[PDB]
A paper describes a structure:
In Drosophila, oligouridine tailing by the terminal uridylyl transferase (TUTase) Tailor of numerous RNAs induces their degradation by the exonuclease Dis3L2, which serves functional roles in RNA surveillance and mirtron RNA biogenesis. DmTailor180–560 adopts a conserved bi-lobed nucleotidyl transferase fold consistent with other previously determined structures of TUTases. The N-lobe, also known as the catalytic domain, (colored in blue) is composed of five β-sheets and two α-helices and contains three catalytic aspartate residues Asp278, Asp280 and Asp343.
We initially crystallized DmTailor180–560 in complex with the non-reactive UTP donor substrate analog UMPNPP, in the presence of Mg2+ ions (DmTailor180–560-UMPNPP). The structure was solved by molecular replacement and refined to a resolution of 1.9 Å. Tyr390 forms a π-stacking interaction with the uracil base of UMPNPP, while the Mg2+ ion is coordinated by oxygen atoms of the α, β and γ phosphates, Asp280, and two water molecules. His522 forms a direct hydrogen bond with O4 of the uracil base.
Numbering used by the authors: 202 to 416, 420 to 549
Amino acid sequence: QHITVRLPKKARAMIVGEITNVFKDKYPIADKLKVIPEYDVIEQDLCKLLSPGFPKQPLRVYKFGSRITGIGNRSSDLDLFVDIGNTFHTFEHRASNATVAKLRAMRKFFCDSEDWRLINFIEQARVPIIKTCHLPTGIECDICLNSMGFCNTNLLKYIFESQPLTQYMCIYVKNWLERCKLTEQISTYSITLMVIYFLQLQALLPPIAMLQIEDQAVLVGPWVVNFAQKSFSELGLQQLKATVPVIKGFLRNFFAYFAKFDYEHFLVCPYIGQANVEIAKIERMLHARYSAYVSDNPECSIQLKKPMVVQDPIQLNHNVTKAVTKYGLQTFVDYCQQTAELLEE
Ligand SMILES: O=c1ccn([C@@H]2O[C@H](COP(=O)(O)NP(=O)(O)OP(=O)(O)O)[C@@H](O)[C@H]2O)c(=O)[nH]1
Ligand SMILES: [Mg+2]
């Protein structure tokens, strides 16, 4: 514990190499993948496959995840939420056995169909998923019955489009995480929220709470999933031109910030969007819907007694890094420190 975990060579080679890849090559690819014809085919085939099994039931498919927000690549999976029976606005604190049952019933169709290959069936994840290759396109699809990802995907799109610097940084840190082999502890989504929070502290992104001042709210259970698509100019937020030197400097400060962050006392909190949000105080700073929810359901409050706390800005009871261990956090912090050193001018 007294020794820093050495930054893996595969990451080191990417950092000391020019960041020009993302600006010139990976960004155009990521932006194209927000919309391609292949997704239409997948959604159609999913409807063709499943609606026979649920003939008299409403059915809609939603695309979400890294491809749809604009930080994906060629090899990314496509994340799909299949809503059977208009469950969109229903929130399940934990995947209900009925929901698992629904997914199990859906698995059979992928095994018997010719256009699909069942790759994996994951019942015991936070979000149970069917992992299946859409053979006509070769795209690996992760199919779930949870609407929240679609909702926070629409928020990230608004953020990325309003402040492209955010998207460049998420592409960079996503690749960094993969080269550091930290994906088992710190997910792409977690680090996306950390980029967003870091830029909120630079007065370049709004607190999400400032986009949900109600006058109306769209809810999934107790969570407010819509938001006002405010002009950044009416928020006084300047929209930066992303240049290689601008991205490099913000990346350097991003890594230095999370290298020195106090994870024992503070949490990453894009909902509040302010510095030094205390773990001991966050639950009283959340609004009436959260307060009422945990009052009646104390067991569903955010998990704060964990090495690393990164709060989802919509599903406010979700610590996205709740799985990070003491040593996983140490590794992340050590890598951030060495990365910042390598990015120094
Ligand atoms: O803790 C989590 C993880 C994931 N998600 C939601 O699930 C989506 C897909 O989750 P994901 O694990 O596929 N992460 P993603 O951003 O797609 O990146 P990649 O590694 O390229 O797949 C994310 O983009 C979020 O919308 C959550 O809402 N909470
Ligand atoms: Mg994904």
